[PDB]
Design an enzyme around this catalytic site. Structure first.
Site, PDB file in Angstrom:
ATOM      1  N   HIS A  10       0.866  -1.173   0.000  1.00 15.91           N
ATOM      2  CA  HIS A  10       0.000   0.000   0.000  1.00 15.91           C
ATOM      3  C   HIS A  10       0.903   1.222   0.000  1.00 15.91           C
ATOM      4  CE1 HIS A  10      -3.538   2.361   1.688  1.00 15.91           C
ATOM      5  NE2 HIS A  10      -2.480   3.171   1.908  1.00 15.91           N
ATOM      6  N   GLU A  11       1.972   1.153   0.829  1.00 14.71           N
ATOM      7  CA  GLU A  11       2.892   2.283   0.918  1.00 14.71           C
ATOM      8  C   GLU A  11       3.638   2.544  -0.371  1.00 14.71           C
ATOM      9  OE1 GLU A  11       2.275   4.306   3.128  1.00 14.71           O
ATOM     10  OE2 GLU A  11       1.341   3.091   4.613  1.00 14.71           O
ATOM     11  N   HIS A  50       1.631   4.338  -2.923  1.00 14.55           N
ATOM     12  CA  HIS A  50       1.525   5.789  -2.832  1.00 14.55           C
ATOM     13  C   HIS A  50       2.628   6.456  -3.731  1.00 14.55           C
ATOM     14  CE1 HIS A  50      -1.723   6.504  -0.194  1.00 14.55           C
ATOM     15  NE2 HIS A  50      -1.234   5.836   0.830  1.00 14.55           N
ATOM     16  N   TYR A  55      -4.193  14.555  -2.030  1.00 16.81           N
ATOM     17  CA  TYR A  55      -4.613  13.764  -0.923  1.00 16.81           C
ATOM     18  C   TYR A  55      -5.691  14.407  -0.099  1.00 16.81           C
ATOM     19  CZ  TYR A  55      -3.751   9.775   2.293  1.00 16.81           C
ATOM     20  OH  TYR A  55      -3.734   8.626   3.016  1.00 16.81           O
ATOM     21  N   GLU A  59      -6.206   6.527  -1.876  1.00 18.21           N
ATOM     22  CA  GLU A  59      -6.275   5.440  -0.871  1.00 18.21           C
ATOM     23  C   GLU A  59      -6.738   4.069  -1.448  1.00 18.21           C
ATOM     24  OE1 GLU A  59      -5.516   4.753   2.321  1.00 18.21           O
ATOM     25  OE2 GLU A  59      -4.120   6.255   1.574  1.00 18.21           O
ATOM     26  N   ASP A  92      -9.857  13.381   8.614  1.00 20.89           N
ATOM     27  CA  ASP A  92      -9.139  12.412   7.790  1.00 20.89           C
ATOM     28  C   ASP A  92      -8.947  12.892   6.372  1.00 20.89           C
ATOM     29  OD1 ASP A  92      -7.905   9.939   6.950  1.00 20.89           O
ATOM     30  OD2 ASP A  92      -9.876   9.113   6.498  1.00 20.89           O
ATOM     31  N   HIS A 116      -9.539   7.841   4.162  1.00 17.63           N
ATOM     32  CA  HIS A 116      -9.555   6.476   4.623  1.00 17.63           C
ATOM     33  C   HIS A 116     -10.954   5.852   4.799  1.00 17.63           C
ATOM     34  CE1 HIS A 116      -5.436   7.668   5.746  1.00 17.63           C
ATOM     35  NE2 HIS A 116      -5.119   6.533   5.152  1.00 17.63           N
TER      36      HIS A 116
END
Ligand SMILES: O=C(O)[C@H](CCc1ccccc1)CC1(C(=O)N[C@@H](Cc2c[nH]c3ccccc23)C(=O)O)CCCC1
Ligand SMILES: [Ca+2]
Ligand SMILES: [Ca+2]
Ligand SMILES: [Ca+2]
Ligand SMILES: [Ca+2]
Ligand SMILES: [Zn+2]
Length: 316
Positions: A142-143, A146, A157, A166, A226, A231
């Site tokens: 997932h990281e 990005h 974002y 996301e 958020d 998220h």
């Protein structure tokens, strides 16, 4: 470092033994020279100063418990590099073999992980809510995803574009998990979250509502926390992606599943050709239908499944 390429052995966060690519020059470093311009893993030593020290070890055996997070961050970044390259033909996150850097042991009891615009960073968890975050292959992927997005679509974002950002990371993190066949599911961070409670995860793609996230556009979070719910609202896109792959009836709309390879490829093309920094959900739908068209033809089943899935979640 400059040295001789070698292979060491260690144990990850979950206790499993793996081989890792190391470099020898007095010490053995966590530097993998077999992948692009290199994969490098650093010790942040419980501080917040980045990147920290390139990981050095005396004997090329990484069986100490302090070693665990570093073994997994290094190993999972390799798998993720492999995924992109073999599956999508993409060399690293920038498409030009950029070096991949990670730091572990960030801060004290830090229950999170992140991409800081330059490198990946992993906390150790506090030991109850999380264990070291690099033990989850979906988290690592997932990281790194990005970084891929930053170099491609560049989705801002926040708000809708941020929730698309996301969903991208959760979708590709899940495809990497199936790719490595490491007990794959459609849940996010199950391997590192609440070591105490079995059966839970951070987020569900199959049923976002299980943990209170929306699964229909009508249920979109419209507030400000958020980053405008990047998220939260990602659950709407995640559920669409699950339906495209697997199929199902959701809110009375039936979707035939076209499988996960095809899902990866339509999303990868939307990401790399069609999406822009300011795309919203409705533009993601146009992008995904166009990619599936490009790929499989206008009158395809693939195109049909993409439309049904977005109608199923209320997007257009
Ligand atoms: O990459 C991301 O989107 C998350 C990074 C968030 C971050 C952003 C900027 C500064 C610091 C941290 C990290 C992940 C994430 O989804 N984090 C969530 C859920 C979560 C993890 N640990 C938490 C602790 C408290 C609250 C929420 C959480 C969040 O930050 O919301 C990805 C998968 C695993 C952790
Ligand atoms: Ca050692
Ligand atoms: Ca799993
Ligand atoms: Ca998972
Ligand atoms: Ca758990
Ligand atoms: Zn994220």
């Amino acid at each position: 470092i400059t040295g001789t390429s070698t292979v060491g052995v260690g144990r990850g966060v979950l206790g499993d033994q793996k081989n890792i690519n190391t470099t020898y020059s007095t010490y053995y470093y966590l530097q993998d020279n077999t992948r692009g311009d290199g994969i490098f893993t650093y010790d942040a030593k419980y501080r917040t100063t980045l990147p920290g020290s390139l990981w050095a070890d005396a004997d090329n055996q990484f069986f100490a418990s302090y070693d665990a997070p570093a073994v997994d961050a290094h190993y999972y970044a390799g798998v993720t590099y492999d995924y992109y390259k073999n599956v999508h033909n993409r060399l690293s996150y920038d498409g030009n073999n950029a070096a991949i850097r990670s730091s572990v042991h960030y801060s004290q009891g830090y229950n999170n992980a992140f991409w800081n615009g330059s490198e990946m960073v992993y906390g150790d968890g506090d030991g109850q809510t999380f264990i070291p975050l690099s033990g989850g292959i979906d988290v690592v992927a997932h990281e790194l995803t990005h970084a891929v997005t930053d170099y491609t679509a560049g989705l801002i974002y926040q708000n809708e574009s941020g929730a698309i950002n996301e969903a991208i990371s959760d979708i590709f993190g899940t495809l990497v998990e199936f790719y490595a066949n490491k007990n794959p599911d459609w849940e996010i961070g199950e391997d590192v979250y609440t070591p105490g409670i079995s059966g839970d995860s951070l987020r569900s793609m199959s049923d976002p509502a299980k943990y209170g996230d929306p699964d229909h556009y009508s249920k979109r979070y419209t507030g400000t926390q958020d980053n405008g719910g990047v998220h939260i609202n990602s659950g709407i896109i995640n559920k669409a992606a699950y339906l495209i792959s697997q199929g199902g009836t959701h809110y009375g709309v039936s979707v035939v599943g076209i499988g996960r390879d095809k899902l990866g490829k339509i999303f990868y093309r939307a990401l790399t050709q069609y999406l822009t920094p300011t795309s919203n959900f409705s533009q993601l739908r146009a992008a995904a239908v166009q990619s599936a068209t490009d790929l499989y033809g206008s009158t395809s089943q693939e195109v049909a499944s993409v439309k049904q899935a977005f109608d199923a979640v209320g997007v257009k």
